[PDB]
Design a protein around this ligand. Structure first.
Ligand SMILES: [Mg+2]
Ligand SMILES: [Mg+2]
Ligand SMILES: [Mg+2]
Ligand SMILES: [Mg+2]
Ligand SMILES: [Mg+2]
Ligand SMILES: [Mg+2]
Ligand SMILES: [Mg+2]
Ligand SMILES: [Mg+2]
Ligand SMILES: [Mg+2]
Ligand SMILES: [Mg+2]
Ligand SMILES: [Mg+2]
Ligand SMILES: [Mg+2]
Ligand SMILES: [Mg+2]
Ligand SMILES: [Mg+2]
Ligand SMILES: [Mg+2]
Ligand SMILES: [Mg+2]
Ligand SMILES: [Mg+2]
Ligand SMILES: [Mg+2]
Ligand SMILES: [Mg+2]
Ligand SMILES: [Mg+2]
Ligand SMILES: [Mg+2]
Ligand SMILES: [Mg+2]
Ligand SMILES: [Mg+2]
Lengths: 177, 206, 262, 143
RNA sequence: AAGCGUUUACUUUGAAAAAAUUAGAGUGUUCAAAGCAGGCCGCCUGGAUACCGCAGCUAGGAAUAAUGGAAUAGGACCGCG
RNA sequence: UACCUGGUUGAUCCUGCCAGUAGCAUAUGCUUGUCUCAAAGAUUAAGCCAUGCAUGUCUAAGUACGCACGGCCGGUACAGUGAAACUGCGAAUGGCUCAUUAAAUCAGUUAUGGUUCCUUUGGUCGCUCGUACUUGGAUAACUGUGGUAAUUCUAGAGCUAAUACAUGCCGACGGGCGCUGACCCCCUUCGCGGGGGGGAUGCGUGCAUUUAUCAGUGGUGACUCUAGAUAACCUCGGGCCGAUCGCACGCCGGCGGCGACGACCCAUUCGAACGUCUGCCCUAUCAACUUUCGAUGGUAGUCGCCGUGCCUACCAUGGUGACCACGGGUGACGGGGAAUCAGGGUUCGAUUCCGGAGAGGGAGCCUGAGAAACGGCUACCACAUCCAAGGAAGGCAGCAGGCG
RNA sequence: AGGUAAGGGAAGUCGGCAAGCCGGAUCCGUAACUUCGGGAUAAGGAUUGGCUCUAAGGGCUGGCAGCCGACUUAGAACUGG
């Protein structure tokens, strides 16, 4: 049973765990499970103890610090590549992305590079211009439609007011009659 | 949990109806918000249809409107003086719809003095040294002076409101439900309703 | 039922679909759209069972998703798209345009119309709404909410809409003397002029309608669809002209026609 | 008179605190040709469930009944009589339903045993869903 | 042409009232139980109709069955001050 | 097909019942050649279950550095398949069963003017006046150390993206409208005064929410409807005003097409829920019942998607019933229907269609628009699996199959 | 002559002798039988302190105002090992 940080015990206790809680992988969304975890206090009753060395000593231990395993993956986001190689706002980034060479038995050597994400590309620029064109055309069509309705309403209202005026004239005729 | 079931109680004739189904989700009840007075602390709750409801727990300010002159400002609330539902809601300061609370009349006095250029409250014997009221009352141009003279003709206010302004706080009735919307909006009591509630307050005081 | 229903039994399907009983257990459930569940005809039913352009669902899917069918001047890729009353379904490959109009009986009928006629359709306004800035809005029976309408139009009128632009061209006022289509009920398919209107406050009002052969009838407002001013419609009427002749007059005419043909 | 409860009894629509230098009353016509009583317009009471001067709308069905009990406050009980036909024996059964309707104080003088017209509205209480629209006297009883 | 006529039962119509099922139309599943197809030298068509209690709505009738008008005239009608 | 016959007596005419007669079902016995349909563990055990399966899903249009395949035109990223995983959605459909439930469910008729509503379709999406040539860091799949007797159990270390989680702007935008108004100009009076115009500055000025006020564009039979104006509010457990993706690619660094996706609000569709009136088997050896442990109403609140004693606080004593209230039984899911039938009725309806309930018994709940979901979890009772004895894991009234 | 005693609870003794248990008040509830009066405080339950509030129960003077005087009952919050 794994140890859980933030329990302040030394034995075994069952906890309700949800998404975001350690020592639990939910199957469906919202699923919570009763899992028995171990206390965060280290005692003699442990099968395996996890240790992380953060300060290097004077001696070169041949188990951990003797050899440095290179990181398997390189940066993919354009901003992270800029942070890594101290790029500026104007210099291009496509020429500085690290590509991992490929080599094994049989096949030819290969170099593969990840797709750079969130960069300035013509397709993004065209999409931004298209949606700003949609934004301006909506106002243009709304203005034209409003003008057409104003003309139509004016036509209808003047028809109604002259019809009411001749009705009032008939009332005047009745009054004078 | 707590549910609103019309099948859980007796019929019109008084007979007992046995339930034919479990407690459905749509017939649900929730614990009362029980708003208090203090620093604002509002919790959002997921509601049927994916909506959200704002539950207030402690609230300090609210938007109260002066009905006679149509002016409202964000005003802090200090105490609750009356509650027609129960006296426990008076003993423990709880904001509910149709409850009477006390709010300091500073924003109302500032608006009134900046609008009609007349002294509201201001018990005689004191003068403001920083002359912030002096500038707001004086320096009127001659052309606009008759405009303010026209305003001050009808700028008169009731005696009860004048006394409340002199005291520094005035009564108000909350018209919104803090447990639903999260605000404590209300209106200033005036006229017959105000004196009726004053009668209730005086009778309670004894 | 712990939610909305997504299936539809073959037996439970509306009768005017004319669905066979032995073929299957489930009927194609219409997708949600501008027409109700029972007032619509699924596009799979229109192409497979009636037009016989296809045989099974796979063929209907191929036809629909090849972008060949065009309903209301637009292409819908869903097989079970709801096709309702007075809808224009066009197939450009065959140059065939259909207007969904009920025949004398209650079922839908194949009504081929010219491309000149297919450019427009008729809609009945359901309600008038006022927008967030004093903008009048007109809602048709097919969920078309066109704003800035003609002020002369009222609740129970009809309009002619250009499919390409989705804009009104002309309108017909709801009044006595104009033709009306009974698009629902026992008189489904009847065509005749309005001769009387009875007002029943609180309840739904009714209209007495006289046809071209003197067989008057009554219909409530919710099942009325005017189709033009005067005695002439604005659309091409199908065979029968909406009369619903008696059973004996239906029987003898087909017997005489068969005898004449031989 | 008025204002007998803990809260203040007033019409929420009209504004009564307008500066001066009588109180306006809010009322409406319920439609269907029912003429509003003069008492509901010239009175000084308020009522949330009054059909003419309240936040209630009459919609649905219109029924008639005979008032039997007038002990409940702001509501009365009426008895509706009808005949139930049995298919087996070509005769009728005399059955009745006792429903509680909201008697608005606009109708001041009403006795028990008279025909009263009611109309469906929103559910006012647990077993009240109708409001009194008009009142007609019984046989004679004009004294 | 729009609104009003003591209230109902009753009687007739119309409206609305799921399918399948019942009765029933057409139809050589080789007959029938069936099913909704099918027939012609692409065309011609069907996939009808009836009942659906009881309750509610509308429009004709007032024969029969209940109920009121005005009788300490707080009765109509007609105008008046 | 509107149907009878034998039987009490020494014999006769009657009442009277028994037994004969024929369907429709349930099981059984005997026999059984062809062919077309076709019910089939409901009646007792809604009793218990070995086993196997029954819900996963990728399009050019959300993420692709797993050589797991594969092309070379490279050096100005990404050919195209693509396991896995994150992400979005479904899993609340369907199917099985009838245990409970007798104005309850349900059937017919209506209203939400008393509410919500994923998706689809259609409206809106420069309406606001105050680094954008693209903003941030965590994580899976990947590599490596393992633990447990074991599970669809998982930890610690490295990385690495988003239509996952957040921050957040240029533009339209140059000015209008309201208040503020230093000031200025003109007429007239002996004169204060009175009347009429231009205008520095500041603030607010979108839709949606809340609150109060004023007048009454389009409506319903009726609004406290919709719309306009006024003064603010806008929850940090925050609202929208696009920091997305694909196919061909053109015209004067800017304009440009067809789409896909997401989203505040409004109509539409599938519905859902309370609702109005009418209608249900037997039973009086059930005649009064309900009621400050809500019963009938009133007032004001809480909660609820909404209206409602759903609940709270204070008041009135009401509410139903001989027209059968109330209680009890049912070998009672209701109905559309089925058998028998002259006409009238009697009986059945577990059952493929609709509406209701449930997954051994109740209870509680996350997620999600939609569940008090059970092929989802969390407890207790009965049953029950593996075991190292420390623990873990189950619900066939689903399809087959097993026990009783 | 008074008490206290772990675990069992009458196994002691002629015999529950003696001792021990309950015990007041308030709010619920109360059977077999019966002479219908009772059984009955049947049986069986729950609460009880302190402090701070709220509501209700009246006179005298000139549905209103003022001034007085007493004891109670119910409800609520806080708090103590
Ligand atoms: Mg039928
Ligand atoms: Mg004998
Ligand atoms: Mg013999
Ligand atoms: Mg027999
Ligand atoms: Mg053979
Ligand atoms: Mg069984
Ligand atoms: Mg289902
Ligand atoms: Mg049973
Ligand atoms: Mg049963
Ligand atoms: Mg009969
Ligand atoms: Mg059944
Ligand atoms: Mg059974
Ligand atoms: Mg079913
Ligand atoms: Mg079982
Ligand atoms: Mg369920
Ligand atoms: Mg469950
Ligand atoms: Mg199961
Ligand atoms: Mg299930
Ligand atoms: Mg002892
Ligand atoms: Mg002891
Ligand atoms: Mg002994
Ligand atoms: Mg003794
Ligand atoms: Mg005794």
């Amino acid at each position: 049973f794994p140890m859980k940080q933030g329990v302040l015990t030394h034995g075994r206790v069952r906890l309700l765990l949800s998404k975001g809680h350690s020592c639990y992988r939910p199957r469906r969304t919202g699923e919570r499970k009763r899992k028995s975890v171990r206390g965060c206090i280290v005692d003699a009753n442990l099968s395996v103890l996890n240790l992380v060395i953060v300060k290097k000593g004077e001696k070169d231990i041949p188990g951990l610090t003797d050899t440095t395993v290179p990181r398997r993956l390189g940066p993919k986001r354009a901003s992270r590549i800029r942070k890594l190689f101290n790029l500026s706002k104007e210099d291009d980034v496509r020429q500085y992305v690290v590509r991992k060479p490929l080599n094994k038995e049989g096949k030819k050597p290969r170099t593969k590079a990840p797709k750079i994400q969130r960069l300035v590309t013509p397709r993004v620029l065209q999409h931004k211009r298209r949606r700003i064109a949609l934004k301006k055309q909506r106002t243009k069509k709304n203005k034209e439609e409003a003008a057409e309705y104003a003309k139509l309403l004016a036509k209808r209202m003047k028809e109604a007011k002259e019809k009411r005026q001749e009705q009032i004239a008939k009332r005047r005729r009745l009054s004078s009659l | 949990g707590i549910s609103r079931d019309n099948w859980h109680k007796r019929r019109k004739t008084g007979g007992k109806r046995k339930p034919y189904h479990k407690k459905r989700k749509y017939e649900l009840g929730r614990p009362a918000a029980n708003t208090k007075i203090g620093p604002r602390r509002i919790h959002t709750v997921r509601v049927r249809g994916g909506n959200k409801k704002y539950r207030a727990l402690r609230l300090d300010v609210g938007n109260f409107s002066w009905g006679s002159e149509c002016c409202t400002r964000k005003t802090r609330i200090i105490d609750v003086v009356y509650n027609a539902s129960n006296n426990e809601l008076v003993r423990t300061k709880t904001l509910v719809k149709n409850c009477i609370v006390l709010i300091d009349s500073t924003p109302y006095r500032q608006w009134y003095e900046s609008h009609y250029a007349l002294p509201l409250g201001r018990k005689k014997g004191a003068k403001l040294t920083p002359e912030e009221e002096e500038i707001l009352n004086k320096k009127r141009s001659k052309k606009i002076q008759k405009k303010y003279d026209e305003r001050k003709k009808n700028a008169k206010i009731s005696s009860l409101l004048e006394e409340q302004f002199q005291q520094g706080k005035l009564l108000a009735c909350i018209a919104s439900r803090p447990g639903q919307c999260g605000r404590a909006d209300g209106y200033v009591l005036e006229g017959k309703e105000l004196e009726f509630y004053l009668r209730k307050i005086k009778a309670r005081k004894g | 039922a712990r939610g909305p229903k997504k299936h539809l039994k073959r037996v439970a399907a509306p009768k005017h679909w004319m669905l066979d009983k032995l073929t299957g257990v489930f009927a194609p459930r219409p997708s949600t759209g501008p027409h109700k569940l029972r007032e619509c005809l699924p596009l799979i039913i229109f192409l497979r069972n009636r037009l016989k352009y296809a045989l099974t669902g796979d063929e209907v899917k191929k036809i629909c998703m090849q972008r060949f069918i065009k309903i209301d001047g637009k292409v819908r890729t869903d097989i079970t798209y709801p096709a309702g009353f007075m809808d224009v379904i066009s197939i450009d490959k065959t140059g065939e345009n259909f207007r969904l109009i009920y025949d004398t009986k209650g079922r839908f009928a194949v009504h081929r119309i010219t491309p000149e006629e297919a450019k427009y359709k008729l809609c009945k306004v359901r309600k008038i709404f006022v927008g967030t800035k004093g903008i009048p809005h007109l809602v048709t029976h097919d969920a078309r909410t066109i704003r800035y309408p003609d002020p002369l139009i009222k609740v129970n009128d009809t309009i002619q809409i250009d499919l390409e632009t989705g804009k009104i061209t002309d309108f017909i006022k709801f009044d006595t003397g104009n033709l009306c289509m009974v698009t629902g009920g026992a008189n489904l398919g009847r065509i005749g002029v309005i001769t009387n209107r009875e007002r029943h406050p609180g309840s739904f009002d009714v209209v007495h309608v006289k046809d071209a052969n003197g067989n008057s009838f009554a219909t409530r407002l919710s099942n009325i669809f005017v189709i033009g001013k005067g005695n002439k419609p604005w659309i091409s009427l199908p065979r029968g002209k909406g009369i619903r002749l008696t059973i004996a007059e239906e029987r003898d005419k087909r017997l005489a026609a068969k005898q004449s043909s031989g | 008179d008025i204002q007998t409860e803990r809260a203040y009894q007033k019409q929420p629509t009209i504004f009564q605190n307008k500066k001066r230098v009588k109180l306006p009353r809010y009322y409406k016509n319920i439609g269907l040709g029912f003429k509003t009583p003069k008492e509901a317009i010239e009175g000084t009471y308020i009522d949330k469930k009054c059909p003419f001067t309240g936040n209630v709308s009459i919609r649905g069905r219109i029924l008639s009944g005979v008032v039997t009990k007038m002990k409940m406050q702001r509501t009365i009980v009426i008895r509706r009589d009808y005949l139930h036909y049995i298919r087996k024996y070509n005769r009728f059964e005399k059955r009745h339903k006792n429903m509680s309707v909201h008697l608005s104080p606009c109708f001041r003088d009403v006795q028990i045993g008279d025909i009263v017209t009611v109309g469906e509205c929103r559910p006012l209480s647990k077993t009240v869903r109708f409001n009194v629209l008009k009142v007609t006297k019984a046989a004679g009883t004009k004294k």
